[PDB]
Amino acid sequence: FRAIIESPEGAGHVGYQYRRNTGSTMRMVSDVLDERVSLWDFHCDPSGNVIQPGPNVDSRQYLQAAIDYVSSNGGGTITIPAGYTWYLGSYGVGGIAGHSGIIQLRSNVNLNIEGRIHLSPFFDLKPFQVFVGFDNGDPASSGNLENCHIYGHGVVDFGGYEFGASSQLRNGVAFGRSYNCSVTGITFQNGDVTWAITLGWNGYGSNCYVRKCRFINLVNSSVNADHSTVYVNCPYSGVESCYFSMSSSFARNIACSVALHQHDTFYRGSTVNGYCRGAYVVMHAAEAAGAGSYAYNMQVENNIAVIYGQFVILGSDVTATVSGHLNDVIVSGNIVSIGERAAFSAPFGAFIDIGPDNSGASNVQDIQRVLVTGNSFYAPANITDSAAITLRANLNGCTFIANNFDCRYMVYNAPGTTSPVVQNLVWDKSNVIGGTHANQRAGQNLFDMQFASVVNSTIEVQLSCEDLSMFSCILFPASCQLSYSKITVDSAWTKSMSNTAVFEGNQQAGANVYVSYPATVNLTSYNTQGAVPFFSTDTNYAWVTSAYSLSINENLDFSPPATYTNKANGQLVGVGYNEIGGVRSVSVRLMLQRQV
Amino acid sequence: FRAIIESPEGAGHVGYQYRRNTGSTMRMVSDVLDERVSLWDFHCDPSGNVIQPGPNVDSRQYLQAAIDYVSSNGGGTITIPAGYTWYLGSYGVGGIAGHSGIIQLRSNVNLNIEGRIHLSPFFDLKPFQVFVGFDNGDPASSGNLENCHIYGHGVVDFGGYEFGASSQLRNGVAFGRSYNCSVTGITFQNGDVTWAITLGWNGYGSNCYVRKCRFINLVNSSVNADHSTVYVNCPYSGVESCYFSMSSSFARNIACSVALHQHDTFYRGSTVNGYCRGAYVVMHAAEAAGAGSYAYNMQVENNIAVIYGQFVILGSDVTATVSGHLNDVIVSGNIVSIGERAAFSAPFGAFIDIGPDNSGASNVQDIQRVLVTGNSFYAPANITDSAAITLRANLNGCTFIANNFDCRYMVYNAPGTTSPVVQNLVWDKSNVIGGTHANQRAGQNLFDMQFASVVNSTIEVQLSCEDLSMFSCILFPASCQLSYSKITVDSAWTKSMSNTAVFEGNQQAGANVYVSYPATVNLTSYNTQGAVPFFSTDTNYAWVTSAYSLSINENLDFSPPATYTNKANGQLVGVGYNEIGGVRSVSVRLMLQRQV
Amino acid sequence: FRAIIESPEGAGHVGYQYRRNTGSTMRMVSDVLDERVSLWDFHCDPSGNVIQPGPNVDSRQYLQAAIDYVSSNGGGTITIPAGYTWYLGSYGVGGIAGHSGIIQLRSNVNLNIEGRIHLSPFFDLKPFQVFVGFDNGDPASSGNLENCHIYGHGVVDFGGYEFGASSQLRNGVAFGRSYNCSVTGITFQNGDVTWAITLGWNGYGSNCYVRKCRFINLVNSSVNADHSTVYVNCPYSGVESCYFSMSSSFARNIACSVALHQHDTFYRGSTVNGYCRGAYVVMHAAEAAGAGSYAYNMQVENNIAVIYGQFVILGSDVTATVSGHLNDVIVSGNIVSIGERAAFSAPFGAFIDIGPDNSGASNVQDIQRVLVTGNSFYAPANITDSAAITLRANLNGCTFIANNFDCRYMVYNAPGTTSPVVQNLVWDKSNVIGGTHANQRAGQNLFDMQFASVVNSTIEVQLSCEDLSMFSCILFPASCQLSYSKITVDSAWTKSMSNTAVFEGNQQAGANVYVSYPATVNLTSYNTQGAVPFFSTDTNYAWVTSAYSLSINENLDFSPPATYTNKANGQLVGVGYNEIGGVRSVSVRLMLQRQV
């Protein structure tokens, strides 16, 4: 009896009944202990003696044994205990070896991480993916991971190690072909990695989420090629209420917080600091296997960000046999700024970027039905390379309503680069243009329409303060065709501007172009006393359907017309009034209108 | 001693002190084991021998015994263990019997569901409510349920069984008259049910929530009368970050994700696919007992949906002695689409529906102070039955600002059906109208104002592309009175339209009607050289206060007036200029204006 | 052996191996029991006998012993068991004594509160802070608190006791200089306190959050000086999905739900009832030590509130050596109402308040780059003291887009009080003004511009119904300078108004003022048959650049001009048409325009 009690079966001989309730099960102590499981239950030597974790102990095989065993019973939750740091010091074996995997996750086996998991210097200068849900080296031949949740107040610490070579990959959690998996509460910190977490594989997976996690200092070297902290590669998945921070200079040039790469995905309520980019929203044709060729129902909302490059990047692309499409996107409620930096010191600052594909092509994209509403954006006055939208590839539609943009440019694309074909660009008059960059815009167009063509578009410019430094509010080079569009410049704060809207190819004459903008015009009258015509001296107004005075009349003896129409020779003409006769000559600020 | 140790009291004789700390309590093993409780502690036969769960074991009585016992100690949390499926195979007894109840919930007793709960085929073709918080067959005589939380990574599986008769009811969790209750993390799946979860009873309850749950395939037959996945029937309660999916055809015609039926309730951050409807926001007079006759502070925000019918349905109604009112509603940040379907194959597609009561009455409602802002809506081009708002019952106010609507109709109601009385309908010019349905609108009015009357309303139409197929942008039949309203049609993309705004009863003449829209007008001048009047040939412009040219003047020898007023006989009149004399005859596109 | 087994070391002699797995660690029962810890492990007398909690037992020393011990092992989670109420009955000692502290929190030691914690009447009429994370009486000399989480379904009950003196302070949780700390799930109730929770200290701290908590009835007496339920005094921190309720009359005059006082903080998805105020968003110079002098990236979104005073209060202030700045703020998606109350019975009702500092100064503030978008606000028709914005101190910018405001005033400041200097106030035309207060505005200006000066501002007034009671839509007293601004009043619903915009100092004449508004004007013509001038009888239109008719012409024999310009003497002049000669005299409603 004493022998049995002291044996490993001893708890199985000590009886227990819950709270002494006579109606409860007559169990043994070991049965109640068997209701929970921890790493300590597997962290032992071959004789079964517990081993203390630490920097000289490789915990990997013990944690794998625990996972494998719980998997064999239909699942459960393994605790990684608080008050200890559990080091990982070798690669895993089998199916995860193809992925540089350390631990293999298994279906229905959750990890409650309350302590700390650290990488040992075995991993210095090497690739690694700490937790891998694939079960095969070839993701296409992998089985699924289902019902796997990682959660707790604990920490995954990547040991500070730099990348050995840029071509290496490093990840925290790769769930694989992942269905109903999640990470909640965990701090990922102190690394040089490619991703912290990836969800799904090329569209295979569903209902994967990252919630209330922190990602701190996960890029630290010039070797690191690229970084996205969470990559969402399965539908019906997303990221909420997370915290992302970087301190490295390299992070400002390479790091993005989130990638949304399949339909019905979201990124919400998160705070970002120190990153180059906020989120990619992309349909890569190469990733369309599991959920189709369309990324739709994409949501970026209610985030807070200080970044150095672009907040949201939109794109789609093609392969030999598949074409990717991006539509039905909403970007709303986000408050974003470009952090303090020199002009041109990081990738071009933007709220929205329409980005060319990885080979630089701007003629592959199929992006449409995007709504950008109720956001704020700010860039400091010195940051020349700051835009509401950098529109650098073909765009099939994007709608801006009720945003507040306070940066150098509203719409921009660099000249002599890409020549996007633009359709359905809608800039509603309810977009408020801030004044931080007033006086900085010498030689620049606020809306610099450096496109191949623009159709079915609306640009309603409304200033909120003066900026007489700018060359124009909106300019179309002669190379940009413009048709079936509405372009207006409100007169407020424009009285002193030489140029308001500029059409370098006279494109505002087009049959289905609807415009209005202010201009100064010299007129001369006939000598007749009484009702008397005034005519413009210049003949460049053949396209004008009406014009009206924006100037007061300082004269007593006459008045110019209040409103004008045109004549076939391109003159404006209106009927004013000479109280006394005489030829009159005036210069008047007019609102020129065409079909509006 | 050996006897005591092996007895059910044995753990109560084995001493323990936490971590060997001399300052800690000298306890017994059983005391520490008694800190937790699971189903295994009650899942035993009359001799106390544990019973293994499975498809041939009815776990109901054991789970009820556990709940009842924990309730007797002031509460706690019962775990339903992982790695097992726990079948339910009989009805409960007592107070829950009136509700077809299986398990009775009790105050302060939480369920941590980590394993799976399944319904056995005893329930096939029968009604059932799996977990019931009422304690009486008659909800009016029921006590409350307080401080009851269901949570975990587990699953409630309804066994796939179809309904036996349409009149039956089936539910997952009915919390009853429920205060500070919640469901978090749970997957509900594989059923034909009426609701998954209901919160509160006829306004009695408070602080009930459904968070991070999944609802998958909960309608599967033509027998199922109706389905709402979560019904919120108590104030200060709501649904967040949930996932709802249906695959059944029947679901597309009957199923709604959420019902918000009392004040201060919300539905946020959720994803919906495969449902007919997104949310009801309703004050039923029949449900006003617990929290009053007003549903106010209703919030639907930041959701993602693919549906087949209507996204948000607003309503209120009356009984013999109570009148229900709906006000102070916000619908914002939602991105919604009508899924691919044939026209008229499901209930009429809409972003907002103002729905008549369950008896079809449209003259009972009191709905006002609703704000619909910053949403996107899309329906495929073939779906004739798609509208921003189907306004089918009396409306006392609804405000649209800064939405993007891309569907067949903006405002619609079917002719010869209901004749709503409409007040305070506000459609701000910042609503962007998409072009998906361009060329599909032969015989149709974009805003089809099929109402009894419209007052204190604003419709500011702004197109973003051409659609010459449409009969008109906005039309008022002669039966619709119109007063104290503003109706404008911006000219952009309208030059080629025969009809822009149409007032079949000439209602735009009303004293307090403020309108503007484009029209073509034939004018003739007098022969006089010099300043010369032009007059419209038609006499239907008695209501016009000013008009201005939207056309260029192709002539050299004359110009028509830039602006016009009217005359008592209904002609327009303006002063142009004949450089040379002669009678002139022109056809000009004008912007007609009345009091604007 | 029997002796050892019955001793406190007995569990340490009973062997256990998890699930009888031969590959698992050979442990002892005590090792598995040592994986968890509860208050029962420390709630014992000097002989180690467990003590039952209750109203006559002071649990404080036991809970402190537990915290101190777990702290010594590197942390963990202490459970406060369900089914018991644990009373606190004395003050703590040492470093927390300076803060009236009860319990001292320690780093890495979490509290899972499942039971109830109550204050004993020892605390009646006394100050207290229940849980304190400072370790020194002087916060400046305090160490940090890190990785401390309080969570569970339990309750902190403040015993109902009133404050003894107004100068006293009372708090639930003061995390101190707090990094990665949180409270989740907890109900705070039944008190008279200053705060429930405070996060950070004068900018020191990071990543602190309050989530899914309830705060119920935490002000109950006239002694209570002031109350903010959560004070956020560290960056990268915030409040989400919480519930706040008060029933006291005193709460309506003193209580605020949240204070956001450092950068990158948020308040989201919460419901508030019974409070005076929603949130302060403030940079106090006195609090700038830890995180700088700027509060930026401040987010208030998607909340539901019934309040009696002001929803969001903005401010910044200075000390002898530091100046505070507030910028980059977003207020969005909130649905707010002033509860039913008499006019002037609580602090002045407002959606936004620009508040003077604690000494009443209005010339210290530096508030700019604020976006207020997509919110709804309502106040009942009797509440004279209700405004979209009470602008009572210097403002450097605030932007309103696409809100729905339904209250007495849009912009207000009391005359003869403060004279704010206002820059960059932007009120977009997409703000919908509701009609609840129609007919109540005798003697009042809808936009009452009671400022020292206004510059670089935009006010675009758009009515949605008539209110002929109001004195004017917008009025500028002669003392308010106005320059480089745009002020427009849309004509809809204004035909019958005597005054629309009123410039008591004729400020609309300014060189860079852009205005338009309706006015009635008497004109007389010359007798000439044919094209004939009409001239205003009054000479106050020297500032007008154009005007156009808003009236029909009831005459056959003539027509007045459709459009007018001015003359140096301040007359308007236009060219109409006399079909038959004669002097004409008409009174016409015109749209007066200046530089627009």
Ligand SMILES: CC(=O)N[C@@H]1[C@@H](O[C@H]2O[C@H](CO)[C@H](O[C@H]3O[C@H](CO[C@@H]4O[C@@H](C)[C@H](O)[C@@H](O)[C@H]4O)[C@@H](O)[C@H](O)[C@H]3O)[C@H](O[C@@H]3O[C@H](CO)[C@@H](O)[C@H](O)[C@H]3NC(C)=O)[C@H]2O)[C@H](O)[C@@H](CO[C@H]2O[C@H](CO)[C@@H](O)[C@H](O)[C@H]2O)O[C@@H]1O
């Ligand atoms: C860091 C990041 O996410 N960057 C974004 C771009 O991602 C693309 O480059 C990445 C570089 O790290 C990834 O490529 C690398 O990894 C591939 C996957 O590794 C293999 O497969 C894994 C499952 C195994 O575990 C590994 O062992 C390994 O075998 C590898 O094939 C590539 O050779 C390597 O360079 C990234 O690849 C994706 O990774 C995810 C997450 O792990 C995975 O689920 C996918 O299966 C895998 N996709 C593919 C196709 O393999 C790769 O996509 C990203 O392209 C870019 C988007 O912006 C550009 O394109 C837009 C659309 O045209 C355009 O609008 C925009 O302007 C462009 O800049 O954003 C980051 O740069």
Ligand SMILES: CC(=O)N[C@@H]1[C@@H](O[C@H]2O[C@H](CO)[C@H](O[C@H]3O[C@H](CO[C@@H]4O[C@@H](C)[C@H](O)[C@@H](O)[C@H]4O)[C@@H](O)[C@H](O)[C@H]3O)[C@H](O[C@@H]3O[C@H](CO)[C@@H](O)[C@H](O)[C@H]3NC(C)=O)[C@H]2O)[C@H](O)[C@@H](CO[C@H]2O[C@H](CO)[C@@H](O)[C@H](O)[C@H]2O)O[C@@H]1O
């Ligand atoms: C499925 C659903 O929720 N449908 C919505 C409509 O709900 C209405 O019909 C339902 C059909 O299932 C419910 O009625 C059924 O259930 C009643 C309640 O069951 C009894 O009481 C329970 C507490 C017990 O546990 C049960 O054992 C049983 O005794 C029953 O009385 C009815 O006879 C039966 O048909 C639904 O009833 C509500 O259910 C909730 C949740 O359980 C409960 O808290 C309420 O007490 C109960 N209410 C009432 C009055 O009994 C019933 O409301 C819903 O009416 C509709 C809203 O849209 C329409 O009305 C709008 C406002 O006028 C109008 O704008 C719109 O256009 C209309 O279509 O939406 C779904 O159809």
Ligand SMILES: CC(=O)N[C@@H]1[C@@H](O[C@H]2O[C@H](CO)[C@H](O[C@H]3O[C@H](CO[C@@H]4O[C@@H](C)[C@H](O)[C@@H](O)[C@H]4O)[C@@H](O)[C@H](O)[C@H]3O)[C@H](O[C@@H]3O[C@H](CO)[C@@H](O)[C@H](O)[C@H]3NC(C)=O)[C@H]2O)[C@H](O)[C@@H](CO[C@H]2O[C@H](CO)[C@@H](O)[C@H](O)[C@H]2O)O[C@@H]1O
């Ligand atoms: C209840 C509340 O939060 N009210 C808001 C105002 O807060 C200011 O008054 C409070 C009154 O309770 C606090 O002052 C009180 O407490 C101070 C702190 O206590 C000391 O330090 C603690 C760390 C210890 O634990 C305590 O033992 C004690 O030693 C004390 O010094 C004061 O004497 C006392 O009156 C509040 O003080 C802040 O408290 C937080 C949270 O505990 C703490 O983190 C800070 O360190 C501490 N700050 C300071 C400077 O000490 C104090 O700030 C708040 O000023 C106001 C904002 O609105 C006004 O100002 C705006 C900006 O100019 C203006 O726009 C607006 O119109 C104004 O009305 O809002 C509430 O009234």
Ligand code: NA
């Ligand atoms: Na690989």
Ligand code: NA
């Ligand atoms: Na769009």
Ligand code: NA
């Ligand atoms: Na071109």
Ligand code: NA
């Ligand atoms: Na019933």
Ligand code: NA
């Ligand atoms: Na409204």
Ligand code: NA
């Ligand atoms: Na009628």
Ligand code: NA
């Ligand atoms: Na103190």
Ligand code: NA
């Ligand atoms: Na702003």
Ligand code: NA
């Ligand atoms: Na002044």
